[PDB]
Structures are given as C-alpha cells and as structure tokens.
Design a protein around this motif. Structure first.
Motif, PDB file in Angstrom:
ATOM      1  N   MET A   1      95.479  46.033  -2.954  1.00 34.58           N
ATOM      2  CA  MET A   1      95.939  47.090  -3.846  1.00 34.58           C
ATOM      3  C   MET A   1      97.318  46.764  -4.416  1.00 34.58           C
ATOM      4  O   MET A   1      97.798  45.636  -4.279  1.00 34.58           O
ATOM      5  N   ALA A   2      97.940  47.749  -5.060  1.00 36.71           N
ATOM      6  CA  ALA A   2      99.203  47.529  -5.751  1.00 36.71           C
ATOM      7  C   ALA A   2     100.344  47.316  -4.761  1.00 36.71           C
ATOM      8  O   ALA A   2     100.387  47.916  -3.683  1.00 36.71           O
ATOM      9  N   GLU A   3     101.272  46.439  -5.140  1.00 44.79           N
ATOM     10  CA  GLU A   3     102.362  46.062  -4.252  1.00 44.79           C
ATOM     11  C   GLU A   3     103.437  47.138  -4.206  1.00 44.79           C
ATOM     12  O   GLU A   3     103.627  47.771  -3.166  1.00 44.79           O
ATOM     13  N   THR A   4     104.122  47.386  -5.320  1.00 44.52           N
ATOM     14  CA  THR A   4     105.176  48.389  -5.282  1.00 44.52           C
ATOM     15  C   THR A   4     105.298  49.096  -6.620  1.00 44.52           C
ATOM     16  O   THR A   4     104.920  48.572  -7.673  1.00 44.52           O
ATOM     17  N   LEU A   5     105.801  50.323  -6.542  1.00 47.20           N
ATOM     18  CA  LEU A   5     106.346  51.050  -7.684  1.00 47.20           C
ATOM     19  C   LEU A   5     107.649  51.606  -7.124  1.00 47.20           C
ATOM     20  O   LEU A   5     107.687  52.727  -6.604  1.00 47.20           O
TER      21      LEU A   5
END
Lengths: 411, 96, 99, 422, 108, 84, 78, 97, 90, 104
Positions: free
Chosen positions: A1-5
DNA sequence: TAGGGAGTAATCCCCTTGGCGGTTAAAACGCGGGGGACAGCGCGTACGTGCGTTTAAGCGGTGCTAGAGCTGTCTACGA
DNA sequence: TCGTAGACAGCTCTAGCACCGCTTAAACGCACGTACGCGCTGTCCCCCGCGTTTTAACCGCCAAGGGGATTACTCCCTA
C-alpha cells in the motif's frame, strides 16, 4: 500500500493544549514523532479501527481504548488520507460532530480506559485514563482531577458532573484511578486552620491530609522551613506550617497550618522505613523508631521531610515564664510567638512575619493597664501588621527583644 | 448630754396605716425610705441652690422648688404633688 | 436510671427559682477575708463594721447584677450559648469604664 | 445550542485555544480538551476567577441538580447525568477575562429574551351625554418618572384615564376587584384607586394596584384667614365633583363596582408595607390608600387569625392572617395597637373568626410548606390549636418555704418618747 | 407665747416645718428661702412617698404578705413608668431581680 | 493575722455559677471567671480606695458603712436600706 | 418636618460614623432617637427659660440643660 | 469610563470628616426644625444662634458616639448591614433602658 | 467676668511662643468654672459631713483624691502644700 | 500687696476669695483653702498649657485650637476619663482606623 | 474685732477581731455525653454608586418692632 | 426679729424675621453593579448531670480591748 502522506505540523491533543508533532505514515502503520517529546507512536493495520471526523482530523479510535487525536486536517484530507486507507484500512470516517446541542442530558458510561458522557448517541469526550491525573467520586459530584502539563494557554483543570450516587451501580473505572504508599500514620490530629480534627499519612515524596470533608495532599514543595513553637504554659506545643504552596478547599486556600497539640500528645512513632533506607532517604536524622510525642518525633520527621532546619521560636520569655500572651489582632485573640526569622500568630490566622521584610516597628501607645498598648509593624513590602491591646510588663520586654533584633522604631 | 438620734419614720408609718392598716412593715423598708427621702431632699435642695445661684437670687420661693420638681422629674403625679403642695401652701400662707 | 434530663431544663427551673429569690450567694467568711485582704493591700489599721461588710456585699453583688444583665443582653445579640469575654469587653466599653 | 452540524465553529478555536462567547447563537464555545464545544446559556449557572499570579483559575458552574434542579425543574431530567462545573487555567504573558465578563450581559439579554409575556381588552369608548369625564387625576404607578396627570372617563365595561399625553389607560370592570375611594376628609389626597385582578402592561410594567389621586397639600417651600376659605371651598367643590363622578359611575356601573368606603372608625396606624400610615377597613379589605401602595387584602379567603407578639410592652406587634389559601402568602402587620386589638378582634368575630392571639413566631413560609404536605393532616397534627398551647411533658412549679420569717424585721412599736421643736 | 401647735396640721400633714427650715439653714443652699417653699417640699415628698407606699402595699397585697419584704419594694420600683425611669441607678438591699423568661431560650 | 492572698482565687466556680443563674446565664466557659475576678474586684478596690479616702479623712481606724454610702452615691451605684 | 435632615446628610454622619451598609429603617430610627434627645434638652431648657422670665433664648439655658443631664459642653462659659 | 470602587472613598471620608468638625446637614433646614420643635409648647422664642449651633454640635456628637456603638454592634454581629434592633441595643446597654 | 486675663498671662509665661483662639480661651474658662465648682461643691459636702465650719486644704486634698486618685494628684498636693507654706512664711 | 504674691501664685486669691465670700459653702473661710485651691488650679492650668503646646507642636501650629484639645482628649485618655460625657466645641473625633476595616 | 468652733482630757462601752469544737453543705474530680456552637455552599435581595436636574440656602443689601439691658426709686418676709 | 433684694416704672439698645434676587450646591433618582445575611449542611465539643468524696463556711462560747460616742475648758479666726 501507500508509503506516506506526511504531516509535520498537525496537533495531537494530549491532555490539554498539546501542540504539533510529526505525522509520518508507513506501509502498514501510522507514525507520530512529537515535536516536544520525541516519543515514536505506531498505529498499524490491526490497531486502527476508526478515525472520528470531528473538528477536522484523524481522531483515531483504536481498540486499545486509546484516542489518538490527530488534528489539523482540512476537509480535503477526508479523502486523500482515505485514499491512503483504501487499500487495507478502507475507513468510513464518520461525519459527526456528535454533540453541538449545548445540552447536558446524557449518560456517564465507564469505559475501560476511557469515559463517555453521551448526549443522544453522540458523546462529548472519551478522555482516557492516561489523560486524567486523578479521579475520586462524590455525592453527587464525581471529582475528575485533570492536572494539566503546565500550559500557559487555556488549561482545563477540574471537571465534575451531576452523577447520581452509583444508583444500583458502582464506581467502575473511577475506582480504577491512579495511585496519587503510606509509611507513617498520624491520625486525628487537632487542627485549628482548618478548625477540627483530621488525619495524616506519610508517602515517600509527599503526604496526604486524610479526613472527612477538607482533606488533601501535602507536597514537599509546601514545606519550606520547619517552625517549632512551644506553648506559653508548655501544656501545649503549637505546630504551625508555612503551606507554601497553599492547598485549597473549594472556595479558599490553606496558606498556613495551625496544629494545636497538647503536651500530652505523647506516643512513639513508627517510621516504617529501614535504617539502611533512611540513610539513603533522610540523611541521618531518623532511623526507624524513636519514641516521643505527636509533636517531638513528628517534628523530627518533619525536619527530615523538608530536609531543612528550624526557624527557632521565641524562647524569649515576656513575663512570668510565658512565651507570650494572647492579644487582639485581626479581631482574634491569639499567641504572638516570635521566631528566628520573624514572628508567627495563632489562631486567626497563621500570620507569618519575616525579619528580613520589616522596615520598622511603630507604636500606638495606649493608656490603661488592662492591655491598651498597640504594637504595629510596617514591613518593606508594605505589609503592616498592627497588633492591638498589649500589656506593660510584657510590652517592655517585647521592646527589648525588638531592639535586640534591631527592628526600627517609629512613633 | 441628751444627743437624741433623729429620723422621719412615724410619719410615713402612720400614713402607711392610713391607707393600709392591715399591711405590716419591716425596718428594712424604713431604711429604704429614709435613704430615699434624704437622697431626694438633697437632690432637689441642691438643684434649688444651683438655680438660685443661676437666677442670682438670695431667696428660694416655691416657684423655684416647683420648677425644680418639674425639671428634675416629670409626670402628672408630679403635677399632683404640685397641686397638693400648692394646696398646703395656700393653707399655711393663709395662716390656716 | 439516673435519669439525665435536658441538661439545663432543670437549670432553667433553678433560674426561675432563684430569680424569684432575693438572698445572697457569697458566703461571709472568704468574702470578709477578701475585704480584710484588699483593704490592707491599700492600707493597714482595719477596724471594720460588719454593716460595712454587708453593704459592700450588697454593692458588689449589685455590680454583679449589672454585669449579668450586660452579659445576658449581649448574649441576646450573641445568638450563642457559650460565653465570650468579648461580650464583657463591649459591656465595659459601652459602660465606658474603659473604651 | 446548535441543532445543526452545519452550525459549525465559525472560527475553529482549536487553532488558537481561545475561549469564545456567542450571544447571537445563544451559546458559548469552550475548548474542552481540544473539543471547542458550544454550550447553551440555559445549561450554565455561572463562572468566576481566582488570581494566583499568572496561572489564574476559572470555575464554570453549569445547570444541574444542586445548581438548577436542586439535588427549578424547567429542565426536569435529573437522572440524565449532567455536568456540574469545569475549571480552566491560563497564565499571563489575557483575553479570558474579557470573554469572562461577557457572560454577565449575555445572561442579562438572555433572560430578557426569556420575557414573562396582562394586556386588557381595547375598551369601546362611549362619548355620550352621560359620560363621567373627570379631569385632574394623578396615576400611581406613574408612566413617566414624574407624576403623570390625566383625566378619567367612565364607560359601560371600563374606565378611560385619558392622560395629559392622551394615553387612554382603560380600566376594565371585569379587571377591577377592589375599587377604592379615599376622600379628602382631612386627607392630603382623594383617590380613585382601582385594585385590579390582573398585572396589566402599561407605562413600563405590569400593575394591579393602580390609584388616581389629587394632592391638595398645604405646607411647601416657595390676621387674614381667607386662604383657608379658599382651601375649604376648593377641597369641598373638588370632592363634591368627585361625588358627582361617583354617582355618575354608579349610573354607569349600576352600583356593581364597590367604591369601598374607608372604615376609619376601626382605623389605626399599622405596617404590613412597613410604613405606618392610616390603616382602616373597607368592605372586604383593610386599606392604606392614603399613600403608595394601597393595602389590599381579602378577608374572605382567611381560614382564621393568629395575633403575634401579644405580650407586655409590645405596643407594636404583628398578626398572622392565616388564609384558606396557603399559597397566598401571609403578611405580618407591624405597629398593631394594643388599644385597637380588641375592636379588630370583635370585627373578626363579625368575620366569623373567634379571636385567637399568641406570642410565638416561626418561619411562616415554612409552615406554608408544612401545611401543604396535608391540609387536613396538619389539622390532625394539632392544627391551628398549635397557635395557642396543647399539653407538654414536664412538672409545673412546686415551691418550698416561700413565706415571711418570724424573725424578720417589723419596726411596729417604735417609741412613745417623742416631742416637737423650738 | 402660746402652745406650739402643729404646723403640720397647718399644712394638713405629718411633717415638721421648723425642722426642715433648720435643715435648709444647715445645708447652706442660699441666703434665704421663701417660707412656704420647704413646706411645699415636704408636701411634695409626702405625696411622692405616699404614691410609692400605696403601690408598694398594693404589690404586697398581691403577694398577700403583710410584713414588708424588699421584693415587695423591688417589684414596686420595677413595675412603674415614671419613677421607675427616674429611679434607675438605685438598687435595694436584699432586693432581687426581674425574673425574665425567654421562650426563644426554650426548646420546641 | 493572715497573708493577703488566694481568696479571689478562693472564689469557687459554682458560687459564680449560682450568681450567673440568678443572672440568668445558661452555659458558661470558665475563662470568663478570672476575668470577672479582676474587674469587679478592681472596681471594689476603687471604692475601697474611695473608702480609704474617706476613712483617712475620718481620722479613724474604724471603717463604717457611712463611707460606703458616700462612695456609692459618688459612684452612681446607688443603694437604699443601708443608710446607716 | 423630621425629613428636613437629608438622607445624604445622614450618610455624611455615618461615614463620619464610619458605618457602611445602611438599611432604610436605620434613618427613621435615628430620627426618632434624635427627637428624643432633642426634645428632652428642649423641654428642660424651655422650662427654665420660662422660669428665667425671658423670651430670647441664650446659651446659659444650654449650659444649665447640658449640665443637669451631664451632657456638658466646654468652650462656652462652663 | 471609571466608576469608583466603594470603601476606599469611605476610608477617605473617615480620615476627613471624623477629623473635621463641620456641619453635614445645612444650617437653615436645621434652624427651621429648631424653631419648629420650639413652637410645640410656647411662642416667641428668639434664639441666640450660637446656642443653636452649640446644641447642634452636641447632638451631632451624641449621634457620632451612637454610630460608634452601633458599629460595635455590627462588628459583634461580624456583619455590615445595620439594624435598628442594634441601635436600641446600644441604647439599653448605654443605659437608656 | 472671666479669668481670661490671668489664663492669657499664664499662657504668655509658660508658652510665650503660642497664639490663641477665642474658643480656646472659652475652653479654658469653661473647665475653670466646671472643676472649680466641682471642687467647691464637694468641699462644701465634706464641710457638711464631718460637722465642719471652715475649710482648709485637707478637705480639698481629700476631695481631689476622691475625684482623681493618682500621681498627677500627688504633684498637685505637693504644689498646693508648698504654695500654702510660701503663704505661711509671711 | 495681694495674697497671690504672698503665696507666690499667679491666680487672684482676692477674686477667688471674694467668690468664696459669694459662695457660702460653709460657715467661715480658712484662708489657706483658696490658696491651696488656686495653687491646684495653677497646677492644672500649666498642665493643660503644656499639653496644648505639645499638641500644637505635634501639629506644627501656633494658635491654640480645640482640635488640638480634642486630640488631647482622644489621645490622652486621662482627660477623657475625667471628662466622659463632657464635650468640646469644634473638636471632632479620631478617625480611628480599626483593624478589620483595613484591607488584608 | 467676739463669740462661735475645733481640739485635748476622762470615763466607759459595743463589735468584732481570733479561735476551737463541733455542726452540715458547697464544690471539684471521674466520666458519659449530647444538645448546642461554629465554619463552607449559594444566592438573591437589599445596599453602594455614575449622570440630570430639581430645587433649597443665604448672602449683597436694607427695615423694623420688640424683648432685653441699664437706671432711678421703692416695699415686704425669712432670718 | 430689718433692711435689702429683687420689683416696678421707665429709658434706651440691637437682632432675627421680613423683603428682593440670583448663583452654587445638597440631594432624589434610576438603573447598574455588587456582596454578604441567613438558611442548609456538616463537624465537632465542653460543661450538665450523676456518683462520690472532701474539705471549708458558720454558731456557742470564751476574753478581753480599743478606738470611738459623750461631755468640759481653752485658745483661735473673719466680713
């Protein structure tokens, strides 16, 4: 999934005005590295079960009982973090905003680590056991003591409710409050400020005034200098304490404690501490068990707990072997006991005078032998202490003792 | 060589019997009344001395004593005392 | 039992009883010893009238009665049962022997 | 407060930790642990501040049992748990004192918003030939701060006090309970008082005791005896014009509205208004219409009478008007004469009230709350026989040797050795 | 001269004229005093004491005790208006008090 | 004959209590007691002083009730009956 | 005209009294006791003023009146 | 806009007016009241007004002593609101009753 | 008359650097007349009491110590006796 | 030639002795009695003049005023003890600052 | 300037000052102990206090009648 | 009991009320702000009362005594 925001600027409200931190994200979890404490927080794919969309931010409800109040997120963060969520979390961030009613009718429900005050399916807080300091109940007002982390902004301190007195119920998590260990036990000591008799139990770094109605803690911040005072007939031994900081009652403070103890308050006192432990703790002033009184061995313990010496009382006898005489001051008849560094009064109220504040003493010379001389003091801070109705054979000795202390004289 | 002790007791004793024959007496009450009358006599006589000096008058009429009564004590009973005394004065000053 | 009454209702009966009565309450011998004491404390050579002694006991107990009415009428405005010397201080104050 | 989620924080004060008051929404936004919650003004008791240096402390009490319900019930849901108080802290580097002092006028205008709203019917004016139109009348309660003057105009179901301003104070006949007419028979005012049945909204307020007087006083700051002729003639012509007004409103009221005559035969100087003026009976009322306000009582709803403080050297004692309606509160008339006691007693015997005195007193509203527990049950609990006396649990007197001693003084046989003087 | 007749009867009284006239000569109150004035004084004091002893005998009859006690005298002086106000500073040997009773001191 | 002492302290509690019960006082803390011993006493000393001022004027070693009378009328503390 | 004494003059007297929070019934109480002390001195001074055979009132009547009641003023004669 | 807080003004008025000897009620309503009460028994009472000011000062000082005693009653109550009960108490303990 | 001449002369003897108001002199002659007649009346009383015809300083001293006992009275008696002795020397 | 000179007194023994001749307090006049009287009067006169000078120098004024005399009354309570109900024209009182009326 | 007033001289006499052997009765100690005394809530109802004006005081001046101050001559009642 | 102390008849003086007029200030008052008196509640608390001892107040009687009540000369003071 997505790493960071990543966020580096958003609040997590941790017990009051607790400012921004560092909200990084990871590929399974959510990382909070605060800009004041530096503690690393991880909420993983198994911990995050809800994030409240209240004002907005990720008020993340894990099943820990913990409320991770991430905050500082605009409405555009309602979806772009949910796009972060859309792989594994897929979170339905609820819109509410549960209680804008301004209306207090709701139910107190003990959470296991939290506490809800529900207002029509929409509560107002779930402030955790970690974000409360102390909790006692009451009748019918449960005392929630939120001791704030010294915030100069708006800082909530004490909260209490109308809680009906556990009507077919019990203090569940209220009994699951924090432990503020008793060592030595001073029960039913007769105190004049406040008038009555209370209890005392000694903790390793502070104490607790126990009792019925007005009964509080005694930090060692409060004790600053031991004040040992006798009685003028020695049938008593007053014991007055510079409560600095003053503990409070609900309306006013307790600036100075007066303890009226007789000469017959005589008991050996069990300091429940080993001799090897007090040489660590008390610097060779107590061991475990020295006999004495509820004054003498008490003041030994008190000198040990303040770790500070005695402002010696007035051993100057005025007349006929008395320490002093009762006198009228602030419409109160009481005993003006001199001190090594000032004066002390009894019993209304505990007026502690310093010697290093007195600009001068000054006289209001009365007429009759039945106590008409008046002995005022102007100090350098402007605090005038105007003692009224003094005798002659006693005031003439007070005069000599004031000139011995070189406290100047105006007429 | 006589030196007789002196008071005013039989007068009020008889007047006591004039209005209360049945009622007995104590010499306690006799001391009460003698102390009383010497007191009030002294008070009004000294006030008469005062006011005769104040009016610059060598004499004291019963004008003086009447106003000393009425000043020193009010009352319709005081006015009745004025009436009785005025009666006895008009009596004896008529040589009756 | 011994039946304890209301602690004061019997004393109320005693107040009503003795306020009807007019006699002395100070016994003669320590009183006369006080008279000789304080008189010789001023000045010696004390031949006494017992009439002077009884008149003194009358005068002093009358002064006591003045103190009693001052005490109890301040106790009216005290709204209390136990007695304070403050009452007597104001009694002498409005009496004007010391103010 | 808000019943809309769209009623949002207009400014999110979480971004400042700034307390905010919002009277236009009748609420207050407070940062309750990062939750700037709005709060209804009708859910909050009050607030105060304590200084200690910089970190001051604010208590904020809320409407709850113990604060608004009691622990009245305009919020009758006590078992729903409320909040009692909260406590803020702020240092000094504030605006918290500024938002603190706002709550005062917030609650002022908020209870002003909680207005009470007795508006009478618009009177049908009848300007006919038989129109009793009486000039020079002084209303009290006045409309302006000065003494308002005007002119009374009688009709078939009301009066019309046409003011000097022209404000037609309409006094309905089904509004008046007690019409009063104090004459100027030696009086300084001659009044047309009309005690209503309604607190009517005029002038600024809602009034029931409304009086219409004309002051004809004598001594002020500015042998012939013709000014006294002027005084007697003007008092008599004005009072006989007022009697014409009486007999003309009796031609309009048709003798239905009682101009209750002052019973100055039973007159006295009492004080339930705590100002001793002329108190004398009327038809069903004692009255004090010689001043403001006039005294209005109902003799009819009186269960019985307890006289208070009937005791030695109490010339100015009181009396409990024990009403039938104990929700009707009881006045204690100061300065009741001992001389005027018994005539009012036998006048109460004419009110079918046997004359019952007393000395003792208590909280009388407490006794009102005690008798509304059970009216006939309190009557079982002694009742108003409680007002006198009803047995006890003690002895009596029981004396001892209360007699004259045989050895006591008796200077009877004094002496016969007596003589005169030289 | 003739027989020294009672001038008390010439005032219709008990009291001696020349004796009180000697008293006014002794007290040095003035150079002289009008002749009916001490007689006026004696008559006034006689009326005053008469009012006193009358009300005292009334109160003794209220006690039904012929032999006078000072509590007769005490309730006599206490139970008056005018001379009660006039004679305030005086107490009585074996006098007694006013037995005042307070119902506010009495429990309910 | 005796050392002039310990007789004002010889005054007992319940005698004072009897005086205060005809005084009509209902319950009393003692601390009043010794207070009274000094005040009435001094006033008594006062009039004894006055009596001394009479008796030294009276050229006597005898003390009469006459000097009591002169004192009490000059006190304002008036008494009848004991007129000597 | 007992109300010739103004309530502010009474407040002047009461802060010259040093007395702070004053009920409305204090004022007429004080007016009554005022009239009492007033009328006693007036009664006695007028009584001797009639006895002094004069109409115009001097301060010696005040001297004698304050003398007899012991309310005596210094500064004027005695 | 300042509104002066009470009590310190009263302290200044204690320091000023208890020190001062001047009249609080004005002279002419006083004198009018003097002759008003004087008429109650007798006409034609010409007044040397020095005597009137003397009795004015005397009665006002009597009032001031009464105010002292009334304040003694107030502090005995440990209160600040004044009652005429306390005033008659001061009368009777003063020895008027 | 008044003693105001003599009071003013005693003033300008013992405190010559002291102005005076007329009300102050009125105070002076006021207690002069007051305490003069107090002593005079009490000495008249004591002349009546012990059967006395003329008056000396003994009765005046006694009336003082009745009225004012104390040490001001002691020095008053001392000054009075030494002035009487000065009068007695001629 | 006067007796004030033989007694060394300031006050007129002739005037006081003539007022005693107009006194008639007793039968005759022992001539040492008005001497002793005027001596005590001169004593208390110098007493109150010293008190007035002290009250004037404590208030830094020269003219004798009854405000200084009232300070002598209210502050030397021997004078107010002898003169209880005896009052003073234009005197005032102490602005007596009590303990409870002060702050703190 | 003389005649009444206070003092030293003699004789006797009443009260109490001391005190012990008895009498009885007022008071302090031990202890329960409870009805009374005194310090926080709490609030609202009576008390303290800015601005407008509303009217009272009395001085700038003058008239005035009458009670009071001073002078001459005189008569009767307590000492 | 005598003679002088007010009394009576005049002779002359000045003081608060009356009168015209206007400025300056004491005070009502009205709504606003305020603060503590009394009731409720709670928390003690020290003499009242009962048992008990216990030690002191007071009469009979003795025993004289001493400073004072009483009356006689004798030198001394003042309007």
């Amino acid at each position: 999934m997505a790493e960071t925001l990543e966020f580096n600027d958003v609040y997590q409200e941790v017990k009051g005005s607790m400012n921004d931190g560092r909200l990084r994200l990871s590929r399974q979890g959510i990382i909070f590295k605060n800009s004041k404490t530096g503690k690393v927080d991880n909420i993983q794919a198994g911990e995050l079960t809800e994030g409240i969309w209240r004002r907005h931010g990720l008020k993340l409800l894990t099943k820990n009982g913990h409320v991770y109040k991430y905050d500082g997120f605009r409405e555009s963060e309602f979806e772009k973090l949910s796009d972060f969520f859309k792989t594994h979390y897929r979170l339905e961030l609820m819109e509410k905003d549960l209680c804008v009613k301004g209306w207090n009718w709701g139910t107190v429900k003990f959470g296991g680590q939290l506490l809800s005050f529900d207002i029509g399916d929409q509560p107002v807080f779930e402030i955790p056991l970690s974000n409360v300091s102390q909790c006692t109940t009451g009748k019918n007002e449960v005392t929630l003591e939120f001791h704030q982390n010294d915030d100069a902004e708006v800082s909530l301190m004490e909260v209490r409710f109308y809680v009906p007195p556990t009507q077919x119920x019990x203090x569940x998590x209220x009994x699951x409050x924090x432990x503020x260990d008793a060592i030595c036990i001073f029960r039913e000591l007769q105190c004049l400020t406040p008038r009555g008799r209370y209890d005392i139990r000694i903790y390793p770094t502070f104490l607790h005034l126990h009792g019925k109605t007005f009964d509080y803690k005694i930090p060692y911040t409060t004790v600053l200098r031991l004040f040992l005072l006798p009685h003028k007939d020695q049938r008593q031994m007053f014991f007055v304490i510079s409560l600095d900081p003053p503990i409070k009652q609900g309306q006013t403070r307790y600036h100075f404690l007066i303890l009226l103890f007789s000469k017959d308050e005589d008991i050996s006192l069990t300091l429940n501490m080993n001799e090897e432990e007090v040489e660590k703790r008390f610097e060779g002033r107590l061991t475990k068990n020295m006999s004495g009184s509820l004054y003498e061995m008490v003041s030994r313990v008190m000198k040990a707990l303040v770790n500070r010496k005695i402002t010696v009382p007035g051993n100057f006898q005025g007349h006929s072997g008395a320490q002093c005489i009762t006198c009228s001051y602030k419409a109160s008849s009481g005993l003006l006991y001199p001190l090594e560094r000032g004066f002390i009064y009894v019993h209304k109220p505990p007026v502690h005078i310093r010697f290093d504040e007195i600009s001068f003493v000054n006289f209001a010379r009365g007429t009759t032998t039945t106590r008409s001389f008046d002995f005022e003091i102007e100090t350098k801070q402007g605090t005038q202490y105007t003692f009224s109705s003094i005798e002659r054979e006693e005031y003439g000795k007070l005069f000599d003792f004031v000139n011995a202390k070189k406290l100047n004289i105006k007429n | 060589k006589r030196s007789r002790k002196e008071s005013y007791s039989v007068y009020v004793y008889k007047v006591l019997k004039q209005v209360h024959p049945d009622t007995g007496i104590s010499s306690k009450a006799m001391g009460i009344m003698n102390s009383f009358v010497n007191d009030i006599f002294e008070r009004i006589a000294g006030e008469a001395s005062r006011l005769a000096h104040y009016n610059k008058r060598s004499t004291i009429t019963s004008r003086e004593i009447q106003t000393a009564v009425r000043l020193l004590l009010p009352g319709e009973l005081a006015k009745h005392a004025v009436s009785e005394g005025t009666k006895a004065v008009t009596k004896y000053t008529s040589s009756k | 039992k011994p039946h304890r009454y209301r602690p004061g209702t019997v004393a109320l009966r005693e107040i009503r009883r003795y306020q009807k009565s007019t006699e002395l309450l100070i016994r003669k011998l320590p009183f006369q010893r006080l008279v000789r004491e304080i008189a010789q404390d001023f000045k010696t050579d004390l031949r006494f009238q017992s009439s002077a002694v009884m008149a003194l006991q009358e005068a002093c107990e009358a002064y006591l009665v003045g103190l009693f009415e001052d005490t109890n009428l301040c106790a009216i405005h005290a709204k209390r049962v136990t007695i304070m010397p403050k009452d007597i201080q104001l009694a002498r104050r409005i009496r004007g022997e010391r103010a | 407060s808000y019943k809309n989620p769209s009623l949002m924080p207009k400014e999110p004060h979480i971004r400042e930790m700034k307390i905010y008051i919002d009277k236009k929404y009748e609420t207050v936004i407070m940062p309750v642990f990062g939750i700037a919650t709005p709060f209804h003004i009708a859910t909050i008791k009050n607030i105060s501040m304590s200084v200690e240096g910089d970190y001051t402390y604010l208590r904020i009490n809320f409407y709850c049992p113990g604060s608004a319900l009691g622990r009245g019930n305009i919020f009758p849901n006590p078992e729903a748990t409320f909040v009692k108080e909260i406590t803020y802290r702020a240092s000094n580097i504030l605006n918290l004192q500024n938002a603190f002092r706002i709550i005062k006028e917030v609650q002022k205008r908020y209870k002003x918003x909680x207005x009470x709203x007795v508006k009478q019917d618009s009177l049908v004016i009848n300007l006919n030939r038989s129109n009793p139109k009486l000039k020079d009348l002084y209303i009290r309660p006045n409309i302006a701060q000065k003494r308002m003057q005007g002119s009374l105009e009688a009709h078939v179901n009301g009066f019309r006090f046409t003011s000097v301003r022209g404000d037609k104070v309409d006094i309905l006949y089904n509004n008046i309970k007690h019409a009063l007419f104090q004459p100027c028979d030696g009086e300084m005012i001659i009044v047309l008082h009309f005690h209503l049945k309604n607190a009517i909204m005029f002038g600024k307020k809602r009034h029931t005791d409304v009086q219409f007087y004309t002051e004809v006083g004598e001594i002020t700051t500015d042998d012939d005896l013709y000014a006294e002729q002027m005084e007697r003639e003007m008092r008599h012509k004005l009072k006989t014009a007022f009697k014409n007004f009486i007999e003309k409103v009796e031609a309009l009221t048709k003798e239905e509205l009682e101009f209750e005559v002052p019973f100055r035969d039973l007159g006295f100087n009492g004080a339930p208004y705590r100002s001793t003026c002329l108190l004398q009976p009327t038809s069903s009322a004692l009255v004090n219409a010689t001043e403001w306000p006039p005294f209005v009582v109902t003799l009819d709803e009186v269960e019985l009478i307890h006289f208070e403080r009937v005791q030695f050297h109490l010339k100015n004692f009181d009396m409990v008007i024990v009403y039938k309606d104990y929700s009707k509160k009881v006045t204690m008339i100061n300065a009741i004469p001992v001389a005027s006691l018994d005539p009012i007693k036998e006048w109460l015997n004419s009110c079918d009230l046997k004359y019952t005195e007393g000395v003792q007193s208590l909280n009388w509203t407490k006794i009102m709350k005690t008798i509304v527990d059970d009216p006939e049950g309190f009557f079982e609990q002694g009742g108003w026989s409680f007002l006198x006396x009803x047995x006890x649990x003690x002895x009596x007197x029981x004396x001892x040797x209360x007699x004259x001693x045989x050895x006591x003084x008796x200077x009877x046989x004094x002496x016969x050795x007596x003589x005169x003087x030289x | 001269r003739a027989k020294a007749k009672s001038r008390s009867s010439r005032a219709g009284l008990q009291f001696p004229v020349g004796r009180v006239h000697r008293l006014l000569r002794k007290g040095n109150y003035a150079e002289r005093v009008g002749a009916g004035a001490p007689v006026y004084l004696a008559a006034v004091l006689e009326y005053l004491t008469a009012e006193i002893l009358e009300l005292a005998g009334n109160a003794a009859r209220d006690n039904k005790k012929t032999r006078i006690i000072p509590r007769h005298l005490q309730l006599a002086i206490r139970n008056d208006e005018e001379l009660n106000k006039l004679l305030g500073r005086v107490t009585i040997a074996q006098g007694g008090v006013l037995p005042n009773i307070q119902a506010v001191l009495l429990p309910k | 004959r005796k050392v002039l002492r310990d007789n004002i302290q010889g005054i007992t509690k319940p005698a004072i209590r009897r005086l205060a019960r005809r005084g009509g006082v209902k319950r009393i803390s003692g601390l009043i007691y010794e207070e009274t011993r000094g005040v009435l006493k001094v006033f008594l000393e006062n009039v004894i002083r006055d009596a001394v001022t009479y008796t030294e004027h009276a050229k006597r070693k005898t003390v009469t009730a006459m000097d009591v009378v002169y004192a009490l009328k000059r006190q304002g503390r008036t008494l009848y009956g004991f007129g000597g």
